[model samples]
Target: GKSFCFATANVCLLPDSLARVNNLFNTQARAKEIGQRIRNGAARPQIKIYIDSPHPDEAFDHEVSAFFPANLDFLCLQEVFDKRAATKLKEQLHGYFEYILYDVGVYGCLNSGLLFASRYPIMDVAYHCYPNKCNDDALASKGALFLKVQVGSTPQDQRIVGYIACTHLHAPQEDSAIRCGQLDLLQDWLADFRKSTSSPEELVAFDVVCGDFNFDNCSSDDKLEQQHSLFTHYRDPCRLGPGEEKPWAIGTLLDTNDVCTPDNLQKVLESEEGRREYLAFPTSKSSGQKGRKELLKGNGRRIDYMLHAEEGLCPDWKAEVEEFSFITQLSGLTDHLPVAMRLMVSSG
Candidate 1:
């Protein structure tokens, strides 16, 4: 059966001593609001949100309560700087929420990469550290968080399950060689994980890998183009192929169009002439590029993604991807747009 709905936001809460708490709160609120919007409209059996953020502790409790009011099956986060955040989030979210942090020395930085929180009982959790050694010039160690979650009706059986991996990969242009190396490491780790698990032939689990990869499809550069080639093995539901068309439906009902650019709204509201001017020119895809380059810069590519493994899961499960352009509205929330998907799992 399909088990999870996933999303990713590179809420860049860059290490600020004082603003950390405020930033965390604001980010969490925005994320929850987005999630609520998704939940209101999208049809899915279950939903679990995955976020990649730094400093999970400062606003961990408030964030959890704010976002996951009902109950969250899983929450995967990245760039968790402190261990206490993990413990506190787990405790506050209750017994069902399991927070797993990579060991202190695992990444060698204060806030390195990847963390997971599960509302469902997690059968097992493991860390797969990529072999790519962090260069002095690099941002930080690029790594992933892996969780084995039990799904379906029979928890006692525990046989029916799925795996969720949260990752933060290097930007495509940062160093293609390194990015390629990281991909290699990821492939090897997944292969080994499948081999180590019992009955590799049987579809015992579904695999969903989510995070920011930093590759832009619109860019003409070879590095950006090459970065996209690595995911040939996995399926990207958001975009199938160039020029392949899909219907555009509103995933959430939030009025994100005016969250940013108050002046634009004021002009539209004040005068019919201004409104006509605003409406005369259609919203531009160029705006997406501008927003991406201006805000994310290096990690600016439309590299954020949700990918699925070929085997070990139900084939009937479908993927629906939506790239929310709230940031371009000048929401001042996060730079990168939040990408989410609803996976329809069959009971049989």
Candidate 2:
């Protein structure tokens, strides 16, 4: 059985050092070491992966090259600005990979939706643009990205894999309905995909749906609680209990009253308490007051997710879902924390 690791990091600007470190860490030397360690005692299914890079520029290439030696199987990227970036990424990760880009537009803050890159050949790919009208009376919000890929373990045996929609939902105070509607669209799409595979043999061999969900947990007002709305249709790999979920799964919330200043970044970087409370996690810092509000809320909500199909066809499949804070600790690579998971696929 072979394992696959998947990560979703929102690198805001794709800094040089972060890209260098990421590349260094994903070397074959490190991969083999990690693989050996996992084979020895880690887990049945394990994968080391990275999903970052804001733009499709040279920095993205450098960052991706870091993990190139690791033989990364799949990458889910966000915020790819234009076709040029997509072309560059494909060129950079050429022979070993192929990508599908979802280009909504070339404007707005959150421009791109998702980019699915795979070492395996992509079979059927689809895209759904979330109704932008719901976000702010404009049909311009980033939509979801979906792809169905074929992975061949051997020359003869190939399996049909399904990659559910990946999206960056809008973070609007009065857009719960919009978010819910988007989820409905997602659910309908999955249901249709599942139904269309009427033949037992045509059924998807494995299903993986992931991306930044943008559902924050800071607001005391649950009016914006569309966080896990879609989980009702899919199995949440990180759901701990009835009411308990990991706090580190999403952005950190800070106190509303705490005045945000450049000096606070150091405190956030140096102290574990600071990391836990405010610094390293993803929070909207578009406004100073709002940034302080997010910080005060402290460990906002677990919005970003990696959800899977409920059929459980894939065996030995497990996840190592966590919110990474390294980039944030280094001083806010992006406004969001990277959430990742490891999955193992095999024929049983």
Candidate 3:
């Protein structure tokens, strides 16, 4: 059977120059593969994803304008409860992302602050509310909003499928335990989310979760903590037992801006919290969220994460974390900076 995927192995073939070396070759291969699939006239599913959390006011538009890549196919936004802002965004990114899904928004009575904008036709959409919420976070549903998109990135026997999920966990600094519990529920809920609503005949290739997770990744480079495994990055409720979290950082990790500079950016490497934030992997900076406290109070670390299942759940095909990075050196439209990632799936 025919398969749809990027020519990621082109690097193993040959190289033109240093700048267009292995890294650039991989990126170019992904782009050309998708473009070639389209030119060959087939239902191919290759996508570039962008994520951000904007303040409900003018910042929302500014963030969208600031972070949107030229060829963006999908956009996942958090803290988007304002009606006017949602409308404006729908119009602003209309052509590229014609399909947009935002959860319930009502002042004093809102649900999830998730708004998933995409270019592909949506097959299904559902909001999985967290079983628990703390502080003001409970007012908004603050759960995972899942969107099943028909990108046709997989094999014919399987559904050309992908998922776009956006969520914001408990915010209060002391709610680490609560955040852990939320992570647990989120992993479990996704099992149900990955299933296809179209027909039992279809299967999802991979699932992606992008949002402000409110936690730090266990790293090996930081002088604070001992050299540990990459699995220590994010706590997984599903992988409780030993050797359970064996597969993390599976796709791409980008640090465009350490948005949590207020607490964990500069002076956090000494204290207990600093040790936790500074203790990271080789050559990786903190991509944490903005803490509630100012004047260097409360807690902070790389909390925002854009996870991918690029390795492929099956043998023949999978997606690649071709491109991933934050909005580098640039202040974001919202308090929390935005990040972008590109995905290319293939059978070869």
Best candidate (score: lDDT): 2
Which window of 10 residues has the lowest lDDT sum in candidate 1?
59-68
lDDT: worst 10-residue window of model 3: 6-15
lDDT of each: 0.45, 0.47, 0.44
Cα lDDT of model 1 by residue, 1-348, tens digit: 343555554544333352345443543344444334333223232254666773353321111111222323454445443344434433433444444344523522444545555545566565655565446654456676666666654434435667776777775454756666777777776666655554412334467777766444433442433444446666655443532212221111112232444334333323434323222111235573223212321211345666766555545443322221212221244444445443545544
lDDT of 2 by residue, 220-326 (tens): 33234434555665656545433344433334223322233333554453454555555333335465233443344444455566666646454434332222222
Residues 1-348, model 3: lDDT tens digits: 322221110001111232233353342343233223222212223353664643233211211112224455666666554454455545544534567675433211554656666767788777766666356544456677667777664334655666666677766555555666676677666666664454425555545667765444433222121112222432222222332222211111222233543223323332435433333222323535432222232222344566665433555555545444333112212334345555555566
Instruction: Give the TM-score (vs. native) of candidate 2.
Output: 0.61
Better of 1 and 2 by TM-score: 2
C-alpha lDDT of candidate 3 relative to the true structure: 0.44
TM-score versus the correct structure, for each prediction: 0.59, 0.61, 0.55
